[PDB]
């Protein structure tokens, strides 16, 4: 019933620097050590370093020597992680741990990208006669090149939810995201209705309704 | 540095069953080990320290044991919230090192994927790029291989994968693979194929289309 509260998500351009924070409540940080750990997308935990707030002494893993700098301020009972010369390799969720690992922060997501806000481009993934079996056809929408996350995808103004699979976004080398949203439906319905995906990207206020009609090949 | 070899990396089980995962330290760490759990939402909690001591609040179904340099975590009577990721952590020396992790997911019967291949839309082609997507719908287990072959030549580095979280209703996974080429390199070839290998298929299934016929 003690906690560590980390700062909000960051969107930073490469070559720049960021300072994340972790504020403790329920104890005085000078009494224990404060650690920072990294977790790249879909990967494991990697230790960065730790600090003794009582005297400011730090220890780092050699792999982060010229990348991370850790500090603490007992007056605010907060610890900081400053990451320099950001590259794509730095995109990850950063955790703060203290009280021997008993307590962990919720984590702070850092996304390194040089891209400016951009709405997505929406292309159809047309149901094909060749890609039809047992009375069902698969169709979808490719929402490509948008920044930043998140994007909302609906089908037939939300009246279609069953069988829908909207995949998690992939950050491309361009510093832009892309994802696919597919759905399997009765192939017969393709003769009485047109399927449309409703894509909405709030940061750029881009709303697109894309019709996905059959195109066999 | 002390290397922590955690195995298995994946574990499939059902409600009420017991499961165990182990970590092996490359050097003598004499029980200076902890077990952490990370839920699907990202939050992390320590369940055990000193190899076998449970922290306050942690359920009785969790236990840890030592056998030489092999440290194990056992979850008896699995419950719904236990479907998570686990990591061992050694605090014997700096730098601190973690195990590779172990995913505890829901056991289910085998389910072969429904494979579909989608050619790039003409609206995208005219803008300069071409994205060919291969869809693997509702399959189990998670293990699946997708190979892109353009004119039989195996592709590498020009595709990206994305996989859904185990489905709440049928416990299956779905995966999408996207091959990305420039309009120019796309037009240099004819047959685009997606070869899928999965336990539920007797032999790998290949789905293809011939550019130019579109």
């Amino acid at each position: 019933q003690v906690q560590l509260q980390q700062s909000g998500a960051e969107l930073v351009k490469p070559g720049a620097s960021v300072k994340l924070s972790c504020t403790a409540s329920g104890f005085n940080i000078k009494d224990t050590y404060m650690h920072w750990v990294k977790q790249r997308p879909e990967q494991g935990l990697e230790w960065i370093g730790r600090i003794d707030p009582a005297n400011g002494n730090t220890k780092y893993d050699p792999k982060f020597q010229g990348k991370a700098t850790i500090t603490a301020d007992t007056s605010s009972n907060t610890a900081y992680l400053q990451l320099s010369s950001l590259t794509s390799e730095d995109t990850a969720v950063y955790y703060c741990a203290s009280y021997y690992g008993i307590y962990w922060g919720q984590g702070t997501t850092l996304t390194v990208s040089s891209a400016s806000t951009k709405g997505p481009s929406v292309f159809p993934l047309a149901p094909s006669s060749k890609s039809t079996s047992g009375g069902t056809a698969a169709l979808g929408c490719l929402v490509k090149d948008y920044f930043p996350e998140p994007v909302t995808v609906s089908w037939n103004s939300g009246a279609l939810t069953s069988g829908v699979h909207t995949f998690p976004a992939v950050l491309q080398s361009s510093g832009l995201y892309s994802l696919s949203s597919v759905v399997t439906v009765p192939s017969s319905s393709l003769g009485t209705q047109t399927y449309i995906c409703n894509v909405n990207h709030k940061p750029s206020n881009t709303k697109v309704d894309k019709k996905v009609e059959p195109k066999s090949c | 540095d002390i290397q922590m070899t955690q195995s298995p990396s994946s574990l499939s089980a059902s409600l009420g069953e017991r499961v165990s995962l182990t970590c092996r330290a490359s050097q003598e760490i004499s029980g200076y080990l902890s077990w952490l759990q990370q839920k699907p939402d990202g939050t992390i909690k320590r369940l055990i320290y000193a190899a076998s001591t449970l922290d306050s609040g942690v359920p009785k179904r969790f236990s840890g044991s030592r056998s030489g340099s092999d440290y194990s975590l056992t979850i008896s009577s699995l419950e719904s919230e236990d479907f998570a990721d686990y990591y061992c952590l050694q605090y014997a020396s700096y730098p601190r090192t973690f195990g590779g992790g172990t995913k505890v997911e829901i056991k289910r019967t085998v389910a072969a994927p429904s494979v579909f291949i989608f050619p790039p839309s003409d609206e995208q082609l005219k803008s300069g790029t071409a994205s060919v997507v291969c869809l693997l719908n509702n399959f189990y287990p998670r293990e699946a291989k997708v190979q892109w072959k353009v004119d039989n030549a195996l592709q590498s580095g020009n595709s990206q994968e994305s996989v859904t979280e185990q489905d709440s209703k049928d416990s299956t996974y779905s995966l999408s693979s996207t091959l990305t080429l420039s309009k120019a390199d796309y037009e240099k070839h004819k047959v685009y194929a997606c070869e899928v290998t999965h336990q539920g298929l007797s032999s790998p299934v290949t789905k293809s289309f011939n550019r130019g016929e579109c």
Side-chain angles (χ1 to χ4, degrees), chain A residues 25-82:
Chain A
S25 59
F27 67 107
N28 186 331
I29 67 170
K30 74 150 185 174
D31 291 331
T32 186
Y33 295 93
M34 296 204 80
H35 303 249
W36 283 93
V37 334
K38 172 189 192 176
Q39 183 173 224
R40 282 191 202 92
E42 300 179 0
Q43 299 310 292
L45 301 174
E46 190 172 12
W47 186 74
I48 299 168
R50 57 119 275 242
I51 188 169
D52 180 343
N55 63 11
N57 182 92
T58 47
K59 298 200 72 174
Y60 299 94
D61 180 289
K63 296 191 289 290
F64 292 91
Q65 224 75 69
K67 173 58 63 178
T69 308
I70 295 162
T71 49
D73 182 24
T74 47
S75 310
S76 53
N77 220 48
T78 300
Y80 304 86
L81 201 222
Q82 179 188 95

Side-chain angles (χ1 to χ4, degrees), chain A residues 11-12 25 27 32 51 55 60 68 70 74 78 80 88 97 100 102 111 121 123 127 134 165 171 174 192 210:
Chain A
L11 287 174
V12 193
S25 59
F27 67 107
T32 186
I51 188 169
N55 63 11
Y60 299 94
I70 295 162
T74 47
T78 300
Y80 304 86
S88 58
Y100 274 84
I102 301 175
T111 306
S121 286
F123 308 113
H165 284 305
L171 179 62
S174 52
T192 30
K210 245 300 191 314

Side-chain angles (χ1 to χ4, degrees), chain A residues 197-214:
Chain A
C197 62
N198 323 111
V199 184
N200 183 29
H201 184 236
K202 294 179 181 177
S204 63
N205 302 109
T206 304
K207 305 188 83 161
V208 183
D209 291 323
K210 245 300 191 314
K211 292 189 188 181
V212 47
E213 62 176 337

Side-chain angles (χ1 to χ4, degrees), chain B residues 169-187:
Chain B
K169 294 294 164 63
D170 64 17
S171 307
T172 59
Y173 295 91
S174 291
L175 178 165
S176 74
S177 189
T178 313
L179 207 197
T180 311
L181 294 178
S182 60
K183 188 188 181 176
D185 298 326
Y186 176 65
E187 294 176 306

Side-chain angles (χ1 to χ4, degrees), chain A residues 217, chain B residues 186 189-190 209-214:
Chain A
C217 185
Chain B
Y186 176 65
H189 310 106
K190 61 161 189 169
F209 71 87
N210 207 300
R211 179 195 75 76
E213 294 186 10
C214 292

